């Protein structure tokens, strides 16, 4: 019980850090997916959003919710 | 007077002019005094210029000596008084007049308005004040206003240095000050031709010109926002060699591509006000303007500046802070009178930071505002033994002077709070402790403890929010180095130093750092590409090479050092 | 570009992750963004119309601004930037006025006074940049100082006094608990916490009263929790204890899971409680918990009833009069000194007794003179109340910037010994900066008994107390001095990240963070001594060290000292020739003739030549010595810097060994390496010796480096981060490492079906 | 005058807890009516509660009861949670008697005609093996929270224990204020009110009760003139 | 223990512009909360009765002087701000003021159109001399609270007109006090009195009744 986070804070980083190795991986993790989502909104086919989007949700905030739900997997170089 | 060497032979003077005006100077620390003096010469002239309620003897002599006040030369009587000039008919039979500076701009943009204090049929004497200067009232320095003060920490809005004010100070123009800006533009002979300023502009709607006269200069009394046109000027241009897509529209719409380029004066970014006056200097008639210049016009813009959240206030004791918030007069801690307090000052600065005097002029401020009548009929209390006669009684709103190193002493101050006559319907608002039960104007319940209230003399400081706020998305770029720069129409760019780069590295944010140093500052190709990307909504492009680094190689080469990029595969690259 | 600044004003109503942004500033800052949205929603058809629409500040654009601003972070920064916490991310909120509203808790990090300070605002543009602001630089994720691990966003100055007052206990307060007897029942108890509020609004209950009630939602203390249940808990269960109504409302601010506290919320206590929360709870919890302490702290700071006036600031008149006899007796004793009754030392000592008498007299009055409930005392009891150092920090940064964690573990068994609160019948005062946040090189077992803690454990604060029971007096802990990593250092050797409280993450540039952690207080037996150490210069006043073990013979020449060490070999006696009596002997008690001495003891109080102890005790000891000296200076000023920061800097001083002769030149890297000797060299010399020639040029001796680099025809691999910053490449730290910048993000086949 | 837009919304935290939000107000109207709402809900809603009780066997014994684990105090505040609505509007006396070992609840007490207990499962006391209990209760309608009156200060009723009376059904209330954009200015009041209620009445109905007693309260001032054109507040 | 006797509101008088009001009976801790609930509304939302803009024939802006007069235009605007007017006509209307020769211009010299009235004619505006001619018009509008000078670039007034800060607040100074009597034997209750003072543009009863109507209509929690 960590009451509902507001805007930027959600989702919590701790629950996100379980989905990757480090905080730096989480950055690249969500970043590249953000570029992926925005390309899909214009036009090597593009995927997403896997989670039902918000009213005007930004693609970066979508990729963070996706990572929190384990909806994608990444591989580190 | 005693000579420096004469000091050895035989056995208030240490105070300066700015320092000698701080009431209760002895109780404040020496370092705080100097800091308080600097802030007195930092104030700005207010429209009303009310005189201090608790001061010292220096205000009168200091004001007239400054020279910004009008003093009668010879004893006599006035003849006629108008805002423009005052004339006095001397008994001697001579006749002297005085033209009053009205809304003259100072060096730093402050207003220098004078006011006449005398009337018709009034006798005057030599060395007597006739008109009030900018920061004077009736002849004494009025650098600020007197405000009701509560010294309670008010729910973090006055946190640690900040201050909260009543909306009254805005409605009543008590802290309002006028500021005047000067703008300049000239027409001279050019290499190609001659500069010409006129209403006609190459590409404009008739609405932007709607505030220009024949000559193309803004008309007096006009309102100007950021980016509006002040003076319309034009300079030769050619060869034009216009782009084909540009001309095709020229033929379609039939607007002939003019032979001259627009160089017109526009009000800087973030400035606004009315146009006071214009000064035009033309070569045609008279006017010694330097070789090349053919005409000059200066525009004077002035603005009433309401006290705004963010501005800086400060007292004479060195205490200064930003206006953190401005609460509606309603939801303000108010005395049992329903009398809202103006500002709310936090107590936290006081602990072992001595500044003790600031609390004394607060109590003496309430004494001077409410009036008093000592109880001396049979008592003649021991504390008033050293006091002078007839100071015993004073009416409401009287002014007081406590010279620095011998002013009111501590014991006397306590007795004065005992005799503190009522407000309109007989009742007492401040106890002998200088405290009162304030009612929280937002909940209605009284504040559980008695709070110190009083009147303090505070000043509006020189630098204001309007001048200090800056923002930029895209603007001018330096020539030698492509890094952004703000010239006319400020648009200046914040500068990201090495220390900031250290922090950025410490976080590990490699991209944020690269972005700041390449595509926001120096990438001649990148900065435009990211702007194009944002508007299209497409992803941000990949940064390039900072122009700073490219220039670095040339600087090494100019020094006879053969720098080679040495790629892994091609082994030799030219930046191009 | 995309930047701005303005003066800052307090933001008491903000969430920790937020900031007040003047609408105008946010308008020009997001100008390009609101232009696209303004055209997409067809308010204006072409882009040219959108530009003039924003330029003239048309009223329609304010609705489009909140839409582009939403969940789009910004970076705030205030110069000077000392540590990485000098720049943080915030959620921008449009606000009226031309001033920036800053959350009150972040003032500590920015050292931001509200006397008119200005703060800069930058706008992260790309996806990677936004993510770095949301994850790496967000305000609510950075709470602990990256130097001491202590909490920074902890309440201060206003909320401290407020919370102090809320939880204080007043005897005989209105509604005070009374265990009524034989005529009525007890009157101090209350049904629930809500009832007490209704008795507090009415004149019945004082918040600072000693009443007792039964709580059904807070967790009871640890000791009392066992007696009551020991098997179940109290999410719906009830229990009674006697505390102030305030102490109840205070514990409500903490998490539900945290045990009841019931103390006067002293300044020192809040640090304890906030520290505990960071260890036991996630960040978001602590962030929200500190946010709740701010509101309560402020609210009760206003109802505190603390104001200054004539009475409180008054200095006691009696104190001035008592000093008259104090000053006359100190002067009367001076008149007897001239007469000849002085006795020449007792007189001088006696005056101190006079002078000490006044100090005692002021104490005799002080608390009795001013009522215990004095607002000036309450502020004291609660605890609420340049470039020269930054010049050093620049050399620090340039010598350690390339030090980053490059692997999780190097697997080395080497380590160093920590004293771990020895001298007990008693915890060492410097355990928090030497043993805290380390990892064990070898298991720690108390004989005879089971092993107390296994090797490679995090050595948290709870572990120390567990270790204390065993009676241990030393511990082996990994360190960056003993780490064997080929490149950089390893996580396990470095240990816990001060900011995160967990294991350090690979890619963290611990070098730069170390230089900052050391440099910040530099501006705050001072900087010359610190600079004397890090630059490896011979001590200002040299102090000799023991060359061999044995007994010592002490002799006193005229104005000199002779110290002969009689070795236990026993071979050639070691004599230390001439030693100024001005630089007196060291202390064990003070050393005397015939004491035993070890191979490295300092014979006289002073600064031992680091190059001396190097040749004597070897590289591992020089590092231990230097760290001891540096940390002693900072400890003298009350600055808490964890040893690992200093160690990061020291590690870079012993990296090279002199050869000069089996090889062409000296000063080749230890890993690079036919006999060479260990070398000690200053940071300035060490940094100028880096393999990158444009890093050494941008640092110092520009003309020199180029000339020698041009002749040698050197080639720079562009490995360090300084170089890449110049040419605009991704720094090889943090999000720039190989492992982290090649992540492939593809959606699982299972998720796409949905 | 015509205010642009008021509104009122409700979200339920639990069965007896709910948040209410008013959006948007005109500054600074949040603080004006805010404190007056919490004050009305807490001390202005009619409801019945316990005033004084008396127990068989407890007359001059201070704190102990025989054959029951719970002591005097623990049972007094055990009963303070008893919720019972009545229309008699006078000090009726209910009775509770249960014999033998066992846990007594608010259902064992026999309610006289006109009184209805709403929390039957409420725990009151645990009994000893081979024990009996008999307690007298005095219930009267109430308003707000009246502390325990001094029993008589007159001749007396020997062995009479007054108890704190939680008259109002609302357990506790607290309010907050936030600012939201009106499309022109940032500073527009948003009123958040937090009410936790007894199961006698729901929060929705509890608010309207405070709205009626308040609007009729201010009707007096409006009656003086009734044509000063105050503010429309639209429809 | 229902002590039911509906609250009673009583008028009173202390001066002509202000007058007390006493309401009884009330529950405990109700006076302070209700009193400030009306004070916050009185001090803000009582409608005016204020002057929006002015226009002097001789001047084009606020920062000049008039030949002959003693006060500058900026000091005359400050004087004009203190005037208290009252208009029962919606739809802005213009007043006039023309004075010539020596004397003192006051609020009485202002000619109000039909439907408006000046309530403090005794006020000093400007002092004129032999050469002083003051020809000035004033625009009166109806609103509430305090509105900053509506600049003539937001509204196309034109060069000529001068916007001025407007203050629609008929209420001058408000306070209150409660005399709750805690009775040990029986009957705890509270009682308050408020002290409403006006600017002579409306009466205390008129204001309190206006504030009452606002709160009443505003407490629409029934939906
Ligand atoms: Zn290692």
From Swiss-Prot, chain A:
Enzyme category, top tier: transferase
UniProt KW keywords: DNA-directed RNA polymerase, Nucleotidyltransferase, Transcription, Transferase
GO cellular component terms given for this protein: DNA-directed RNA polymerase complex
EC number annotated for this UniProt entry: 2.7.7.6
Molecular function, one GO term: DNA binding
Keyword Ion transport listed: no
Swiss-Prot/TrEMBL GO biological process terms: DNA-templated transcription
Catalytic activity: RNA(n) + a ribonucleoside 5'-triphosphate = RNA(n+1) + diphosphate
Subunit (UniProt): The RNAP catalytic core consists of 2 alpha, 1 beta, 1 beta' and 1 omega subunit. When a sigma factor is associated with the core the holoenzyme is formed, which can initiate transcription.
Family note: Belongs to the RNA polymerase subunit omega family.
Function: Promotes RNA polymerase assembly. Latches the N- and C-terminal regions of the beta' subunit thereby facilitating its interaction with the beta and alpha subunits.
This protein's name: DNA-directed RNA polymerase subunit omega
Gene name in the database record: rpoZ
From Swiss-Prot, chain B:
Protein name in UniProt: DNA-directed RNA polymerase subunit beta
Transcription listed as a keyword: yes
GO MF entries: DNA binding; DNA-directed RNA polymerase activity; ribonucleoside binding
Family statement: Belongs to the RNA polymerase beta chain family.
Lineage start: Bacteria, Bacillati, Actinomycetota, Actinomycetes, Mycobacteriales
Annotated function: DNA-dependent RNA polymerase catalyzes the transcription of DNA into RNA using the four ribonucleoside triphosphates as substrates. This subunit often mutates to generate rifampicin (Rif) resistance. Interaction with RbpA partially restores Rif-inhibited transcription; once the subunit is Rif-resistant however RbpA no longer stimulates transcription.
Keyword annotations of the record: Antibiotic resistance, DNA-directed RNA polymerase, Nucleotidyltransferase, Transcription, Transferase
Miscellaneous comment as given in the Swiss-Prot or TrEMBL entry: Mutations in the RRDR sequence (residues 423-449) confer rifampicin (Rif) resistance. Rif blocks transcription initiation but not elongation.
Native source species: Mycolicibacterium smegmatis (strain ATCC 700084 / mc(2)155) (Mycobacterium smegmatis)
Subunit architecture: The RNAP catalytic core consists of 2 alpha, 1 beta, 1 beta' and 1 omega subunit. When a sigma factor is associated with the core the holoenzyme is formed, which can initiate transcription. Interacts with RbpA, which partially restores Rif-inhibited transcription.
Record carries keyword Transferase: yes
Origin superkingdom: Bacteria
GO biological-process terms attached to the record: DNA-templated transcription; response to antibiotic
From Swiss-Prot, chain C:
Biological process per Gene Ontology, one example term: DNA-templated transcription
Binding site for Mg(2+): 113, 115, 117
Binding site for Zn(2+) 2: 410, 483, 490, 493
Catalytic reaction equation(s): RNA(n) + a ribonucleoside 5'-triphosphate = RNA(n+1) + diphosphate
Annotated Gene Ontology cellular component terms: DNA-directed RNA polymerase complex
UniProt cofactor(s): Mg(2+); Zn(2+)
GO MF annotations, alphabetized: DNA binding; DNA-directed RNA polymerase activity; magnesium ion binding; zinc ion binding
Signal peptide: none
Sorted UniProt keywords: DNA-directed RNA polymerase, Magnesium, Metal-binding, Nucleotidyltransferase, Transcription, Transferase, Zinc
Cofactor comment text: Binds 1 Mg(2+) ion per subunit. Binds 2 Zn(2+) ions per subunit.
EC numbers for this chain: 2.7.7.6
Family: Belongs to the RNA polymerase beta' chain family.
Binding partners and assembly: The RNAP catalytic core consists of 2 alpha, 1 beta, 1 beta' and 1 omega subunit. When a sigma factor is associated with the core the holoenzyme is formed, which can initiate transcription.
Its biological purpose: DNA-dependent RNA polymerase catalyzes the transcription of DNA into RNA using the four ribonucleoside triphosphates as substrates.
Name of the protein described by the UniProt record: DNA-directed RNA polymerase subunit beta'
Organism: Mycolicibacterium smegmatis (strain ATCC 700084 / mc(2)155)
Lineage, top ranks: Bacteria, Bacillati, Actinomycetota, Actinomycetes, Mycobacteriales
Boundaries of the shown chain within the full protein: 423 to 1282 of 1317
Swiss-Prot record, chain E:
One Gene Ontology term of the molecular function aspect: DNA-directed RNA polymerase activity
EC category: transferase
Function: DNA-dependent RNA polymerase catalyzes the transcription of DNA into RNA using the four ribonucleoside triphosphates as substrates.
Domain comment, as recorded: The N-terminal domain is essential for RNAP assembly and basal transcription, whereas the C-terminal domain is involved in interaction with transcriptional regulators and with upstream promoter elements.
Record organism: Mycolicibacterium smegmatis (strain ATCC 700084 / mc(2)155) (Mycobacterium smegmatis)
Region annotated Alpha N-terminal domain (alpha-NTD), chain positions: 1-223
Reaction(s) catalysed (UniProt annotation): RNA(n) + a ribonucleoside 5'-triphosphate = RNA(n+1) + diphosphate
Full-sequence range covered: 1 to 223 of 350
CC per GO annotation: cytoplasm; DNA-directed RNA polymerase complex
Keywords: DNA-directed RNA polymerase, Nucleotidyltransferase, Transcription, Transferase
The organism's place on the tree of life at top rank: Bacteria
This enzyme's EC code(s): 2.7.7.6
Record's subunit section: Homodimer. The RNAP catalytic core consists of 2 alpha, 1 beta, 1 beta' and 1 omega subunit. When a sigma factor is associated with the core the holoenzyme is formed, which can initiate transcription.
GO biological process, one term: DNA-templated transcription
Family the entry assigns: Belongs to the RNA polymerase alpha chain family.
UniProt name for this protein: DNA-directed RNA polymerase subunit alpha
